[PDB]
Amino acid sequence: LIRICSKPVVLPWKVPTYKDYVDLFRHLLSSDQMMDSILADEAFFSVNSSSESLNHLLYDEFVKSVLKIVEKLDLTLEIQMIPTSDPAANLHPAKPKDFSAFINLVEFCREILPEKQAEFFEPWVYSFSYELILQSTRLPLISGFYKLLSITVRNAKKIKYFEGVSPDPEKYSCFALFVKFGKEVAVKMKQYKDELLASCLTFLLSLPHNIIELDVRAYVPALQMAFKLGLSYTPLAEVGLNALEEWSIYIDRHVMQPYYKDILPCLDGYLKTSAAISLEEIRIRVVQMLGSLGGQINKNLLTVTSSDEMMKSYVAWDREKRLSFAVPFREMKPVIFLDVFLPRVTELALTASDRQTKVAACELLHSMVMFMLGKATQPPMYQLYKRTFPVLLRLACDVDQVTRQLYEPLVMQLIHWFTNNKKFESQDTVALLEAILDGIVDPVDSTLRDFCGRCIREFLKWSIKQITPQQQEKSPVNTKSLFKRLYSLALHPNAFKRLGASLAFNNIYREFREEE
């Protein structure tokens, strides 16, 4: 097995792969059509000890081997000029070979483990968890725990271990331990990202009704985000609907309906867009399961309406039409206003397929912001600035390195422009307020918070060489008002502003330390 953990990985004589063995171990797990022939052709089982089906012993030997192996192997990361915010970043494996082999083994076992009926796994369902829980308590940042325990609890529900748990002492202790572990990892759900977030989603959404019945409201936002991600990745929605059916059949509609209001709506976009696991059978699944419910019961998918102005976004970014443009032609130059295009082009630049709609949208938005900058030499786009630059900082931290490479030089150039003396009064104030009140406050977008930190850190430059300090005093904007704003945000009870201020100074370290 520690040989087989050295296989090559796959992405989501010739060198082998893990799959080249998985069926074999299923053939080993299902060695019932093959040892039967051997015991039939043999007559040795007269003074021989055993004549039973040894596939149970095969599973036990595999489990004890993998247990001692994973106890033997150890995994850890290391760090590394510039500080990083999230503990999930600035992580480099101390011995990446161990990480790679751990990968190899986990996607090797992920298919072999669940197919066999788990009466063989029953004696392990407690023990195999405990030290693994240890392995999770010391290292709570591993996807293998979540997904392997997903298939583990699937096998357990194939055996029904959690049935009739005490409100058996062994069952009571194991059930309570998984309950507390599940609730704490549900609390910690918020800080994980893809290939780690998805795994713990599969975990905290594969648990049996004996645990959902205890708490629902904590998982309500978890279900919302899991189903909004199931649009992007169908298996999430598939296992989500399976879990929904499990507890809904198993738990009475007496403590979940006060949450049905915000439980239901996150499914709409599934059926709104189109006419192993695909979105189409996803929809057909939700279709009949929704119809299985009563009328008033399934009325609560329309409850998301308080943000009707947010989905509207038809409030004019510029109330008057300030984006006049006469298209150059021979005998006709129609004057065209570009304020109406803003919402649609925002969701293009944010959400577009083919990966080439986005880049062309970026090109047009560069051109049109450039044209409006040229136009500004004649209107108040105060409201336009407030409503439009937040999506610009939203697209600042895009996963596309091409997008950041396009955008950050423009960010620093507009920094140069804004902190100039001619742009230091009454028109940068809107830009600075919208840029500081968004992008660092968010519960998400750690990359965006870091990018805001770096851009303000470099904004310190040309805030002193383009504005003389006496002018900083004359202008109402100065270091002092920035200090009061920082203090006010830092004292805010929401911990997002606290972490934002601490990280902001952590960034300005090596820059503010030169201040005298």
Binding site: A361, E363, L373, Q413
Partner: peptide, 27 residues
């Protein structure tokens, strides 16, 4: 597949509003 692009705008300290109409026309 592979990327497609049409303009790698010039680099500086500020923008150059000297750019022609065609640049805003094509996207």
């Amino acid at each position: 597949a592979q990327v497609v692009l049409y303009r790698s705008y010039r680099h500086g300290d500020l923008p150059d509003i000297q750019i022609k109409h065609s640049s805003l026309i094509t996207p």
